[PDB]
């Protein structure tokens, strides 16, 4: 019996400040796939909400102490009721928060420029001339830091041996791929969005893993199962199909 606090962070095309000449306030400041998703969920489940951006602007990772940051920490501390963002469902996080069923499936892949002999993650691990990395304190960095596969634990050694290999956010990683000889380990959903608007970048290889995005809630929250039921309803109504195609404009790349 009160409006739910929704934590999130800005990232194209999921959550962005809507462009306008007038000054906007409240939830109307935001647009994007995740904003449309929250609006549909709020209508089905019938709740009011307030969008708040996570202060540290991080998704969530654990330090060497076991403490969380980013949106994950907001849920653990019960400072937010829902986390509506491209929040990756991982087994590790399931022990600290609850996830709905996934509303989007994805995988880790590689962002790099076109016209190159590189075709796999193993090609990056076999050399040191081409730098590579990932976003700091994200599920992608966590995947390489926790991996027990020889190739990935070697790539993680290379990522953690260079100070600027791990970037603060997507924009820094994208710009580094453009200005330097650098490949970015990034989730396939954003790669699709970028390669559709930058014809000089492409996805290298396929998906290194397979996972999904889910709505995060504090552990034991009753809204988790309700959000799952709402997500399934949106799938059945083909509304998640429309939403992706609305915000993934298309490849104008010949
Ligand atoms: C959609 N973006 C692209 C992207 C994201 N994250 C955060 C991750 N979803 C999480 O929940 O921590 C990454 O770790 N690597 C990426 O390339 C979110
Ligand atoms: Cl995992
Ligand atoms: Cl696009
Ligand atoms: Zn697509």
Q: Could you please describe the fold and organization of this structure?
A:
With 254 residues, the chain is an alpha/beta fold. It has 2 domains: 150 residues, D-Maltodextrin-Binding Protein, domain 2; 104 residues, D-Maltodextrin-Binding Protein, domain 2. The protein is 33% helix and 19% strand. The protein is built from 9 helices and 13 strands. The strands form 5 sheets. Strands 9-10-8-11 form a 4-stranded mixed sheet, sandwiched between helices. Strands 4-1-5 form a 3-stranded parallel sheet, covered by helices on one side. Strands 2-3 form a two-stranded antiparallel ribbon. Helix 1 crosses helix 8 and helix 4 packs across helix 5. The protein is globular, with a radius of gyration of 18 Å. The chain starts with a strand and ends in a 7-residue tail after the last helix. The chain binds the ligand CN1Cc2c(n(C[C@H](N)C(=O)O)c(=O)[nH]c2=O)C1, chloride ion (2 copies) and zinc ion. The site of one chloride ion has 3 residues, from loops. Homotetramer, and heterotetramer with GRIK4 or GRIK5. Can form functional heteromeric receptors with GRIK2. Interacts with PRKCABP. Interacts with NETO2. It comes from Rattus norvegicus. Belongs to the glutamate-gated ion channel (TC 1.A.10.1) family. GRIK3 subfamily. It is found in: Cell membrane; Postsynaptic cell membrane. This is Glutamate receptor ionotropic, kainate 3.
